[PDB]
Amino acid sequence: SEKKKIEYLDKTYEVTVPTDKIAITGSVESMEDAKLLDVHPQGAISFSGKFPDMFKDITDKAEPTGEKMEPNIEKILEMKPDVILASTKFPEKTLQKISTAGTTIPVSHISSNWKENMMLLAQLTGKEKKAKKIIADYEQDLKETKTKINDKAKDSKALVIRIRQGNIYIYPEQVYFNSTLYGDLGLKAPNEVKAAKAQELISLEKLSEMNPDHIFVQFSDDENADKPDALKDLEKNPIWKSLKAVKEDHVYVNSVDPLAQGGTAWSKVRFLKAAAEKLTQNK
């Protein structure tokens, strides 16, 4: 390892590379990048004090850096990391604080930067060849999938909902799995999604007015602890039962791990595989 210059989102950083002494704080994106690149960081984000089962693969050599939006500077300092992957979600004051603990790179949470985020981690870990192949395969699989989806499915109304604390949410067009569903696969975002500025509640009646052809439903028990029957109560509702998607057996619950971030390389790869299976002409 020598100190190498890293360009990331038009900013220059200097980091000892390749390295495993990576502490991830705030950037759940980078944890999903670690998952895809088989990187085992020294520090990772805790979720209610735990490492989720979906992250145990890459936290096997990790200690917690704090909860997502509460960096534990003492914990980070103790690791003496070569690089801290923080997030653009952190205010400047917080990023400055983290930097007293080591070289800090704020990783973007914007889905359109998915390739740049994975390439950053690849450059830190000597895994450029692997990352470039994953990106190349995704582009190829996406083109192939789009060829295999007929014009009717392409023109259909698809929607991603997530159930959290028993409520139903939709997401902006470029956020969550919508950046794959609409931005990559080229399905048309409904007006409700175009109007959303962040995670947005919808009602069952609005869902019924939308009446999508396809509904991807994400439900994590970990995010519904107090409402564990929320999905089954929805599924029993006569208005849900009347939905075209329900009638046509076009509702896909947990097609991707329900804790998935949605807009990262790992999430996109998994969602593409799922959407391929559900939307392609063989069906």
Interaction of residue 179 with Cl ion, rule CB under 5 A: no
The partner residues of 172 in beta bridges, in order of sequence, read: none
CA 216 from chain centre, in angstroms, equals: 15
- Part of the chain binding Cl ion (CB under 5 A), chosen from 6-14, 194-202, 239-247, 270-278: 270-278
Q: Residue 54 interacts with a second copy (CB under 8 A)?
A: yes
Can you tell me the distance from the alpha carbon of 228 to that of 220, in angstroms, rounded to the nearest whole number?
Answer: 9
Euclidean distance between CA atoms 268 and 142, whole angstroms: 10
Interface of this chain with Cl ion, residues 226 to 265, rule: CB under 5 A: 231-232
Integer Cα distance of 181 and 178 in angstroms? 5
Question: Of residues 80, 155, 228, 242, which one binds a second copy by CB under 8 A?
Answer: 228
Tell me which of 17, 235, 237, 280 binds a second copy, using CB under 8 A: 235
Q: Give whichever of 116 and 235 is closer to Cl ion, judged by the CB atom.
A: 235
Find which of a second copy, Cl ion, none residue 141 binds, CB within 5 to 8 Å per kind.
Cl ion
Q: Name 80's Cβ contacts closer than 8 Å, sequence gap at least 6.
A: 21, 102
d(CA 90, CA 148): 41
**Interface pattern 48-67 for Cl ion (x via CB under 5 A):** ---x----------------
Residue 116 interacts with Cl ion (CB under 5 A): yes or no = no
Extract the runs of DSSP E, i.e. beta strands, from 153-275. 158-164, 167-170, 200-201, 214-219, 251-253
The number of residues making up the chain comes to 283
What residue ranges bind a second copy (CB under 8 A)? Answer: 40, 50-54, 56-57, 60-61, 219-221, 228, 231-232, 235, 249, 251-255, 258
